[PDB]
């Protein structure tokens, strides 16, 4: 699974770690994160994230 970065603040979503404090468990692909989730550091939506290639 690919990492995704918040293009507003630089936070990296790592699917190995998830974001468990906000209900995203380890092993969750970015696409399967509920679409109302926001960047845990800066608060913007998923639509400001881009795949890390
Ligand atoms: Ga951010």
The residues spanned by each domain of the chain are 1-53
Candidates 49, 45, 53, 37; CA nearest to 10 is 49
Between the CA of 39 and the centroid of ligand 1 the distance, in Å, is: 5
- The CATH code of domain 1-53 reads 2.20.28.10
Between the CA of 41 and the centroid of ligand 1 the distance, in Å, is: 5
Between the CA of 10 and the centroid of ligand 1 the distance, in Å, is: 6
Between the CA of 27 and the centroid of ligand 1 the distance, in Å, is: 20
Residue given tokens 């380890």 in the structure block:
26
- In Å, what resolution does this model reach? 1.6
Is 39 among the annotated ligand-binding positions? yes
- Tell me how the structure was determined: X-ray
**CA of 21: how far to CAs of 24, 52, 53, in Å?**
7, 23, 26
Torsion of CA 43, 47, 48, 53, to 10 degrees: 130
């Amino acid at each position: 699974m690919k990492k995704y970065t918040c293009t507003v603040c630089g936070y990296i979503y790592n699917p190995e770690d998830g974001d468990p404090d906000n209900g995203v468990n380890p092993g969750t692909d970015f696409k399967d994160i509920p679409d109302d989730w926001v960047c845990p550091l800066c608060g913007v939506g998923k639509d400001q994230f881009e795949e890390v290639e």
